Amino acid sequence: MENITSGFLGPLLVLQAGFFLLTRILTIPQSLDSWWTSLNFLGGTTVCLGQNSQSPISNHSPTSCPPTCPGYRWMCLRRFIIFLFILLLCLIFLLVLLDYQGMLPVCPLIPGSSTTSTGPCRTCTTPAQGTSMYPSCCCTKPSDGNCTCIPIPSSWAFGKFLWEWASARFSWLSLLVPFVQWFVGLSPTVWLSVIWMMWYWGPSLYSILSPFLPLLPIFFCLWVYI
Amino acid sequence: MENITSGFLGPLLVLQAGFFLLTRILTIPQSLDSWWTSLNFLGGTTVCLGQNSQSPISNHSPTSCPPTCPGYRWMCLRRFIIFLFILLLCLIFLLVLLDYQGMLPVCPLIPGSSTTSTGPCRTCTTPAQGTSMYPSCCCTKPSDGNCTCIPIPSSWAFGKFLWEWASARFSWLSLLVPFVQWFVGLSPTVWLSVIWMMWYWGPSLYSILSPFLPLLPIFFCLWVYI
Amino acid sequence: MENITSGFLGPLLVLQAGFFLLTRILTIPQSLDSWWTSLNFLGGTTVCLGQNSQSPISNHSPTSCPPTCPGYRWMCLRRFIIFLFILLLCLIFLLVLLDYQGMLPVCPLIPGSSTTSTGPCRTCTTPAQGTSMYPSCCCTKPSDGNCTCIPIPSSWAFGKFLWEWASARFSWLSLLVPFVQWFVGLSPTVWLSVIWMMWYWGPSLYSILSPFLPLLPIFFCLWVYI
């Protein structure tokens, strides 16, 4: 085709490109309205008949009530708002996915004597307050100091980049994270079966044993003199 | 008593406040429940089906519906889902805020020739492979030994550089240029006042020109020919 | 064998085989009818729509109701079509039930350099035409006289030449091949949990997939350009 088609080509491409974008947009809004209803439904109906009638219209009105109607106008506004919300939420998944490409560095810092290769310290001595996240380490110090510092290496997706620095701030909270770790060490597969059986639990177990949970203060008093 | 009474009473008050922290956290759940009720019922009231027949209570369980009786499991499930959504959006805000701040790492590696150092270059980089992309700057070039690249910026982590790149990396340059010119040509706040006046016009204009835009969608064979 | 009945043992075996074959043939009709009735009768009853008030049938139903059943001719046609389909299915099953005893051949011919022979090569293959593909190994190369290629292995029933050759056609499929490999390597001992999750929760799975259907072309085009 190419040029020969291009020579005889007219405005067909114009309409072809122009359309189906409105579909790709509006369908996402109507679908989002459907899921919002479902969450509201959770075993409920469609309603959308509370916008009075304003006309002899069939007040069934799934998702948006009807459009071209006074009630559905602000429903259309809510649809536009939700469309903006989704157009925002897409970037969250986009960044979450793209972060594991490894192109991005974490560019972290930690105190140690390790080196990826042959690194001569030459009496590397210049310390500072807050050794973590120190100066740029472009040999930025009282002198050059013969400095070699960290490149962007490989980690469990930027855990060393951000989590490790934050986990240092956890420290004692990270010490309780070891408690949640021996809790996590409890087998997961078996835990999968337990959770599967635990559908009868949850809100139902909450209803079953809520009153005792408020009575936890007696145990707190007991453990006070533990 | 003294500071030993101090410790016992304080463990007691710790139980007490965890109680208050739990109430504060759980408040956000019902808060978001009312949020969804308001948003979905834009100009609408609140009537659950959770106040079903198997509910001796009145319509008091038909607005936001914790609804311990009848439909309870799915209401609590929606509550947990919204809680997860909020605990997600909190990161969406906090990460951007911390990235802008100062401390967050943003070590960049892109092709450039900007120079700011002391007695630099005269060896520089001579990489004729891997295009112009740069790898972790321990010593990016295959044979670089005295290499020194660029330190992270005080301004928000990349962002502007990524936008400038995607202005050509995601192309759209020609289209963006006219659109950017038009946006600059409408930058004046007087038009912003006009746009605000158009709020009432907005839905009204959409209602008036629904068929109007339908007809314009032909444009007499799209501007005669093209 | 050791027959001790002469003309009596053989007739008994023939009668047993005929009865078994007739039972299987009827079951395939009968069991298939029951199966797809249940497919419809996950809910809906079995009252014969094709049956009519020809002779006031007390209950013209029983899935496929035959005899006359007004429109038993259509019922008979459906039964015959189902029987043909079941015959095809069992023939395919029997065909798959092969190559496990080593009877099946899997003589492969693909480009490679693996060597396992006695005093081999030093002449080998010098074909500079037809790319790297190999033809029937009488003597594949245009001028090969002492040629010896590769014997069929003990590797699973699959010829696997179609596999790798089509893995070349769809390298992305070959990429996910390791993914599914460790997914199977994740141990089928926990596959029961996956099965349970697939049940029931598949409804919300399709509910979410509804967004994926709107988002499938968008992401596909995104990575199409990416």
Neighbours of chain C (3+ CB pairs under 8 A): A
The amino acid that residue A210 corresponds to is S
Rg (CA), chain C: 29
* CA–CA dist B82, C31 (Å, integer): 48
* CA–CA dist A138, B147 (Å, integer): 10
Resolution of this deposited model, Å: 6.6
**Count of positions (residues) in chain A:** 226
* CA–CA dist B220, B217 (Å, integer): 9
Answer whether C204 touches A (CB < 8 Å): no
Provide the chain A residues 99-158 that lie in CB contact (below 8 A) with chain B. Answer: 105-108, 116, 133, 136, 138-139, 148, 150-153
The amino acid that residue B58 corresponds to is S
- Residue B107, sorted as left (phi over 0), alpha (psi -120 to 50) or beta, turns out to be beta
Closest by CA to C21, choosing from C90, C102, C76, is: C90
Closest by CA to A128, choosing from A150, A149, A111, A108, is: A111
**Nearest CA of chain B to the CA of A84: how many Å?**
14
Residue A151 near residue B136 (C-beta atoms within 8 A): yes
Answer whether C218 touches A (CB < 8 Å): yes
**Contact at CB, A138 and B151, closer than 8 angstroms:** yes
The amino acid that residue C172 corresponds to is W
Residue C132 near residue C126 (C-beta atoms within 8 A): no
Which residues in chain A are closer than 8 Å to B161, comparing Cβ atoms? none
Which of B50, B72, B152 lies nearest to residue A107, judging by beta carbons? Answer: B152
How does C3-38 read in b/e, with b if 16+ C-beta sit within 10 Å? eeeeeeeeeeeeeeeeeeeeeeeeebbeebbbeebe
Cβ–Cβ contacts within 10 Å for residue C68, how many?
Answer: 14
Q: Would you tell me the crossing angle of helices C72-96 and C9-40 to the nearest 10 degrees?
A: 110
Closest by CA to B15, choosing from A217, A72, C138, is: A217
Q: Which long-range contacts link C150-155 to residues 24+ away (Cβ below 8 Å)?
A: C150/C108, C150/C109, C150/C112, C150/C114, C151/C107, C152/C105, C152/C106, C152/C107, C152/C108, C153/C106, C154/C102, C155/C106
Measured over the CA atoms of residue C45, residue C51, residue C52 and residue C55, the dihedral's sign is: negative
Give SS3 for C161.
Answer: helix
Residue A175 CB partners (closer than 8 Å, separation 6+)? none
Answer whether A189 touches C (CB < 8 Å): yes
Measured over the CA atoms of residue B123, residue B129, residue B135 and residue B138, the dihedral's sign is: negative
Termini Cα distance of chain A: 85
Cβ burial of B75 (10 Å; 0-12, 13-18, 19+) is: buried
Q: Which structure tokens are listed for C48?
A: 């014969």
Name the residue in chain B with its Cα closest to that of A144: B118
* CA–CA dist B201, B207 (Å, integer): 9
Q: Which structure tokens are listed for B69?
A: 């009786």
* CA–CA dist B66, B48 (Å, integer): 10
* CA–CA dist A94, A97 (Å, integer): 5
Q: How is residue C189 annotated by DSSP?
A: G
Provide the chain A residues 37-56 that lie in CB contact (below 8 A) with chain C. Answer: 38
Residue C34 near residue C83 (C-beta atoms within 8 A): no
**Contact at CB, A77 and B42, closer than 8 angstroms:** yes
Answer whether C211 touches A (CB < 8 Å): yes
Give SS3 for C42.
Answer: coil
Report the half-sphere exposure of A71 (CA within 13 A, side-chain side): 20
Closest by CA to B77, choosing from A45, C209, A206, A34, is: A206
- Residue B112, sorted as left (phi over 0), alpha (psi -120 to 50) or beta, turns out to be beta
* CA–CA dist C137, C112 (Å, integer): 14
Closest by CA to B72, choosing from A205, C201, C205, is: A205
**Nearest CA of chain C to the CA of A193: how many Å?**
7
DSSP states of chain A: -HHHHHHH--SHHHHHHHSSHHHHHHHHHHHHHHHHHHHHHSS-------S--SSS--TT--SS--SSSHHHHHHHHHHHHHHHHHHHHHHHHHHHHHGGGS-S-----------SS----SS-----SS-TT-S--SS-SSS------------STTIIIIIHHHHHHHTHHHHHHHHHHHHHHS-HHHHHHHHHHTTSSTHHHHHHHTTTTTTHHHHHHHHHT-
Q: Which structure tokens are listed for C34?
A: 């029951």
**Contact at CB, A24 and C193, closer than 8 angstroms:** no
Answer whether A31 touches C (CB < 8 Å): yes
Which residues in chain B are closer than 8 Å to A148, comparing Cβ atoms? 138
The amino acid that residue B194 corresponds to is V
* CA–CA dist C3, A92 (Å, integer): 78
**Count of positions (residues) in chain C:** 226
Name the residue in chain A with its Cα closest to that of C188: A189
How does C119-147 read in b/e, with b if 16+ C-beta sit within 10 Å? eeeeeeeeeeeeeeebeebeebbeebeee
Closest by CA to C107, choosing from C47, C155, C151, is: C151
Residue C74 CB partners (closer than 8 Å, separation 6+)? C50
Residue B18 near residue B26 (C-beta atoms within 8 A): no
Closest by CA to B158, choosing from A162, A105, A90, C225, is: A105
Answer whether A190 touches B (CB < 8 Å): no
**Nearest CA of chain C to the CA of A20: how many Å?**
11
Measured over the CA atoms of residue A63, residue A69, residue A70 and residue A73, the dihedral's sign is: positive
**Contact at CB, A138 and B152, closer than 8 angstroms:** no
Helix (H) or strand (E) holding C223: helix C202-225
Residue B120 CB partners (closer than 8 Å, separation 6+)? B148
Answer whether A30 touches C (CB < 8 Å): no
Which residues in chain C are closer than 8 Å to A34, comparing Cβ atoms? 210
Chain centre to alpha carbon of residue A62: 30
Structure determined by: cryo-EM
* CA–CA dist A77, C220 (Å, integer): 29
